[PDB]
Design a protein around this nucleic acid. Structure first.
Lengths: 116, 99, 155, 208, 100, 126, 82
RNA sequence: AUGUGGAUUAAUUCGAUGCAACGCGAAGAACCUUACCUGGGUUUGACAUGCACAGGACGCCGGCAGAGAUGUCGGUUCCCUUGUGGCCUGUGUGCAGGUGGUGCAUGGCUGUCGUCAGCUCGUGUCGUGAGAUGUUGGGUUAAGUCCCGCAACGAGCGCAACCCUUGUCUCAUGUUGCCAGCACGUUAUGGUGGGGACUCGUGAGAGACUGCCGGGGUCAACUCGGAGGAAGGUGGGGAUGACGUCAAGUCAUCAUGCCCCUUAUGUCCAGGGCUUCACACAUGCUACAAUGGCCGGUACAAAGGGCUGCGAUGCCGUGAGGUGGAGCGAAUCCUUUCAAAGCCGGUCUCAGUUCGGAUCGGGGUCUGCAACUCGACCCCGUGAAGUCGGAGUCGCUAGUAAUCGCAGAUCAGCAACGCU
RNA sequence: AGGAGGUAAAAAUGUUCA
């Protein structure tokens, strides 16, 4: 939201702190910290700067992160689907693309409720 | 020589016990030694059926096929005994397996 | 139970303290058949109370029970019009059960980030005569004494 | 309908199986050709007194022991009928077929046959009450029995409304297991549909 | 059930017995292993051109008595209804009421 | 020698009792590595405590089937039966304590229409 | 889905229909009934009229839709609202 | 998630509508199934069988067109003994065929009141009679169970019992199952020789019957308590559903009277739909967390399933899974030497969180001709609502509820969180 | 066996043939 290598993403362990990034979960955090030489049991308050630099350059060289990844997602949706594919029609109308009961419970896409 | 491992399967414990008794009687008549009709476990193939043809899932009938099993290891093999067990007749409700 | 009263199940005596009562507390703390965990919880809370006050934790527990257990209870009765609350004498076993239940539930309500901690502290401030369990007891007695007029139904 | 089949109730204690063989993987097609057999000789010679169709088979042979009241109708003059049905069963074979017939001693005491008779007699002209009473009389006069129950259900007397009427004599303890309660069922054909005739015959308890 | 449906299931059975000598199995055992040179074969086209009824994926298991698709039991070749009837009547060896 | 058996909720145990210290050989393990729960241990040692023969006998065993509590109850029964065989005159005390009674309780079978052998479905009137 | 080792699935009818259109360099519409046949990087320009449940549904293929199964471009159901 | 209503739809097949419909028929909707829609074909038909037919082929194998049905081509295309039986060929004729209608015409099957304990009959008696009595009364019982009385005497269906399973113990029994006592194993364990000791399996049998003791009670049923016993009083649970009701449900398992279609209301194929979605109901799963999440280690199960099926070690993958196929028709082998919750330790430290896992993007695997509609699973990423739920409402009396996982049927695959 | 009085507040209706 402000930084890729947020100097304090949140004061807590690294394995779980790096997951405060739109392209990092628990296993990416673990494999990152393994490829580096950084413990995972250590909080972010106890960081250094060189740690942040190696993390930043590793990430920028290996995998994707907030802005570029989110743009990849939205561009995937729009462009690669199209105006009028099936998954695109259902993205457009705000409904579950992957095959789901729309009859009863598609609320995560449809919204809270519009009872008539 | 080699002992042999006559395996008896059926759906009726008294019929299969009768078959095993007949078999031990045969091999003892023709002069062999047997460990006995060891009573193997019984298979219990259960099936749940809806009683009604259209509805009423909560009304079932449970049908079991209770397959009984004995095994007969006869020692001291002899072609006498082999032909004896070849020519002994047993009911269709009992399956024999020679090994 | 129309035919009659059922048998009260015989509780086993705890080996760590020798107490039907701590066994009862275990059975009330229990959830999902997690008896071993409930034993761990109760043992931990008792040993925490021991570390706190430097005495016998079963005795502290019995003191909390003495401060929490009610002698009176209002039982509803739908008399014509609105419902009438009727004070009645609580049996000893009923008082004990209510006390343990209130301890466990008010502990589950309160907040110390660990059932052991919050149970121990509830036991302790009830032993002193402060906690929400004793508050429940006192409110119960207040309600009964208010409704003592309707005691003459005595059913 | 609430009552279970008495046979299915007392299937391993009093009654026994009308198919006496064993199989593991040939069970399915065994059952297939068995039901085909029963359908065949239920459609063919219904005029005969077919009661039981006890089948056995051991890997090359099928015994088709049927039980009948009119062997003269089972087999033709020089057994030409028996040879014909042997032929079509040897088509629908378990690789060889043999068809020793059995004569029942008591068509009045056999539940399926009593129901067969009631079914044929009632449709043409006799009243269901007459038929039921006649069957009950014959059965109880037959000495082995201890009781009988008859139940005719359907458009009785060509009525516009289905009726289920039952008669009985003696004892018919269906909830009791140690009871040779022979059961029989038949769907009498009628110009106004079909009439279900059930028969229960308690011919005494059973030994252990 | 419908006689057309019953005989159609048996037709697909015959088709499977005909076109499954290896004409539907050599294909799949060619496609599975990693040494498959089928990049030049493309006999998946041949498998398409085969009848879809030649595949046992279309093979429905009807009852043999009446043709009921659903409620079928493989051990018997029968629907639940006929299993009930015949097990009561004593026509299914070993099958009796279970009570326990 | 002296062998007994115990059963409790489909948990079988075979007990070879011998004279020794209060040591256990529950399938090559001890009374704490097997049954670390003090309640289970109490349940095991209850008969020996009632007869006042703690530490008189070593107990080898072949716990098989069932879970911890079933196995513990089975072993309780088995050692009680062993104490009967080695000293019948302690029979009244153990019989009063209820260590000879094999608890016949078992899992009640699930039943059709229900969910849990007594848990019926949620019954709505509408 | 559709394991890579087995390769893409394209009904042979549509294949013999489109390969000739390629090698003769004509791009008349193809009346192919089956949908289900994954678009492959062979016919971006040619138009198909796949869904025959109830409508013609032409579809001009592009670069952007290769690999996608042709029926995604041919909605079978119809919903406009209440 | 699943089912339903309604609304959509070309179709969203049909049935089920309080209790007793709504994870129901569906114990397995991608095509099939499928009955529905659009379109393409077909018509004695997809299957039959009797009659006149002229043949030796019928038919199978391939090719081409077609979405396919199928059509059109080319191969290979009868025995029998002269009359043939079979096979088709058509002319058709009969007719088949209808998951087309009426479950208020029906059988069968089922539910349900209710496993409630009641419902009846003969004879006799009372009454003009419908009817009553019996079957009421006192007591007892889980019970119209039993006793004492009684114009009733009796009987029958139901109750109970006989059956299964579980619970204790004996006799036999040792295999593939067990391992006390011997040895061999030295890895990896009853693993192997061995042994019946123990268990276990499975055959038979004993056992619980108020049988015994004490007290109450008609001195009777029966009851309270105790002994002994594994169990004490229908031991626990199943199976078992009287006469009958609800013109309950099913003409869509089947069968079926009557009615209707017979170039179609049949039938083949393809596609699509049964999976829609502004919504509402219902049954469940997963949760909202610390009695917890994650990580590591470590234990204890039962029951069941497996032949064109289980599928092992080993190897490759992160992992679904691929490879290969040992060994097993299975007390052996496989389903890890089967668990999970659990126990120990570590970490998180009350946050929309390392909760929650939906939804969504990408990349895959497996099934199958084929996963767009419309499968499951895996991986990476995303990380929604949800802070224990208004009125109201449901289940449960003990190995129960609550929780944990396991297996099976259907089934290629699964939408199974369901059912058993 | 011998011996005062009580309380349930209100709480409606039911197309068809039957």
């Amino acid at each position: 939201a402000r930084l890729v290598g947020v100097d304090l993403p949140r004061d807590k362990r690294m394995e779980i702190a790096l997951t405060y990034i739109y392209g990092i979960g628990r296993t990416r955090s673990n494999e990152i910290l393994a490829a580096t030489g950084i413990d995972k049991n250590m909080r972010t308050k106890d960081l250094t700067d060189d740690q942040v630099t190696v993390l930043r350059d590793y990430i920028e060289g290996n995998l994707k992160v907030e802005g570029d990844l989110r743009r990849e997602v939205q561009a995937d949706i729009r462009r690669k689907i199209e105006i009028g594919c099936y998954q695109g029609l259902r993205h457009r109308r705000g409904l579950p693309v992957r095959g789901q009961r729309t009859k009863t419970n598609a609320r995560t896409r449809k919204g809270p409720k519009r009872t008539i | 020589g080699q002992k042999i491992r006559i395996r008896l399967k059926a759906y009726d414990h008294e019929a299969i016990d009768a078959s095993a008794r007949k078999i031990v009687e045969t091999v003892t008549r023709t002069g062999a030694s047997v460990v006995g009709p060891v009573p193997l476990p019984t298979e219990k193939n259960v099936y749940c059926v809806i009683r009604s043809p259209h509805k009423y899932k909560d009304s079932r009938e449970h049908f079991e096929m209770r397959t009984h099993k004995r095994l007969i290891d006869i020692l001291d093999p002899t072609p006498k005994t082999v032909d004896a067990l070849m020519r002994i007749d047993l009911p269709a409700s009992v399956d024999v397996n020679i090994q | 139970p129309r035919k009659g009263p059922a048998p009260k199940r015989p509780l086993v005596n705890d080996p760590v303290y020798g107490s039907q009562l701590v066994t009862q507390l275990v059975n009330k703390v229990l959830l999902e058949g997690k008896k071993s965990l409930a034993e761990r919880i109760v043992y931990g809370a008792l040993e925490q109370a021991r570390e706190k006050t430097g005495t016998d934790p079963v005795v502290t527990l019995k003191r909390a029970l003495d401060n929490v257990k009610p002698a009176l209870e209002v039982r509803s009765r739908r008399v014509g019009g609105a419902t009438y609350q009727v004070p009645v004498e609580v049996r000893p076993d009923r008082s004990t059960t209510l006390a343990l239940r209130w301890l466990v539930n008010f502990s589950r309500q309160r907040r110390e980030k660990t059932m052991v901690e919050r149970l121990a502290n509830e036991i302790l401030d009830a032993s002193n005569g402060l906690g929400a369990s004793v508050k429940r007891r006192e409110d119960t007695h207040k309600m009964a004494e208010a409704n003592r007029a309707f005691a003459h139904y005595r059913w | 309908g609430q009552k279970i089949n008495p046979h299915g109730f007392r299937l391993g204690i009093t009654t026994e199986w009308k198919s006496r063989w064993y199989a593991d993987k040939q069970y399915k097609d065994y059952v297939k050709e068995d039901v085909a057999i029963r359908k065949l000789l239920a459609t063919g010679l219904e005029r005969a007194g077919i009661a039981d169709v006890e089948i056995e088979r051991t890997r090359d042979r099928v015994r088709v022991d049927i039980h009948t009241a009119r062997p003269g109708i089972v087999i033709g003059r020089r057994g030409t009928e028996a040879d014909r049905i042997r032929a079509d069963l040897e088509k629908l074979t378990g690789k060889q077929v043999q068809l020793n017939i059995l004569e029942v001693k008591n068509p009045e005491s056999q539940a399926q046959l009593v129901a067969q008779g009631v079914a044929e007699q009632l449709s043409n002209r006799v009243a269901f009450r007459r038929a039921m009473r006649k069957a009950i009389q014959s059965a109880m006069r037959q000495p082995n029995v201890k009781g009988i129950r008859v139940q005719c259900s359907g458009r009785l007397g060509g009525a516009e409304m289905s009726r289920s009427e039952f008669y009985r004599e003696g004892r018919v303890p269906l909830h009791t297991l140690r009871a040779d309660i022979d059961y029989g069922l038949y769907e009498a054909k009628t110009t106004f549909g079909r009439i279900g005739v059930k028969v229960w015959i308690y011919k005494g308890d059973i030994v252990g | 059930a419908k006689k057309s449906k019953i005989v159609k299931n048996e037709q697909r059975r015959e088709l499977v017995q005909r076109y499954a000598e290896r004409r539907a199995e050599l294909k799949r055992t060619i496609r599975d292993p990693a040494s498959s040179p089928e990049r030049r074969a493309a006999a998946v086209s041949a498998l398409q051109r085969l009848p879809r009824d030649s595949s046992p994926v279309r093979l429905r298991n009807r009852d043999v008595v009446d043709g009921r698709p659903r409620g079928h039991l493989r051990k018997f070749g029968l629907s639940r209804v006929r299993v009930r009837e015949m097990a009561h009547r004593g026509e299914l060896p070993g099958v009796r009421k279970a009570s326990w | 020698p002296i062998q007994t058996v115990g059963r409790r909720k489909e948990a079988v145990v075979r007990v070879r009792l011998v004279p020794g210290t209060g040591q256990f050989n529950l399938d090559g393990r001890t009374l704490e590595n097997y049954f670390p729960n003090k309640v289970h241990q109490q349940l095991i040692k209850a008969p020996l405590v009632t007869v006042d023969r703690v530490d008189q006998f070593d107990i080898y065993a072949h716990l098989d089937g069932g879970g911890p509590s079933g196995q513990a109850g089975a072993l309780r029964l088995a050692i009680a039966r062993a104490l009967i065989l080695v000293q019948p005159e302690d029979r009244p005390a153990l019989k009063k304590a209820g260590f000879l009674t094999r608890d016949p309780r078992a899992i009640e079978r699930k039943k059709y229409g229900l969910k849990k052998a007594r848990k019926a479905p949620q019954y709505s009137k509408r | 889905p559709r394991s890579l080792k087995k390769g893409p699935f394209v009904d042979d009818h549509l294949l013999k229909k489109v390969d000739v259109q390629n090698e003769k360099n004509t791009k008349q519409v193809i009346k192919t009934w089956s949908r289900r046949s994954t678009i492959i990087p062979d016919f971006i320009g040619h138009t198909f009229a796949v869904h025959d449940g109830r409508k013609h549904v032409p579809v001009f293929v592009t670069e952007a839709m290769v690999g996608h199964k042709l029926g995604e471009f041919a909605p079978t159901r119809t919903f406009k609202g209440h």
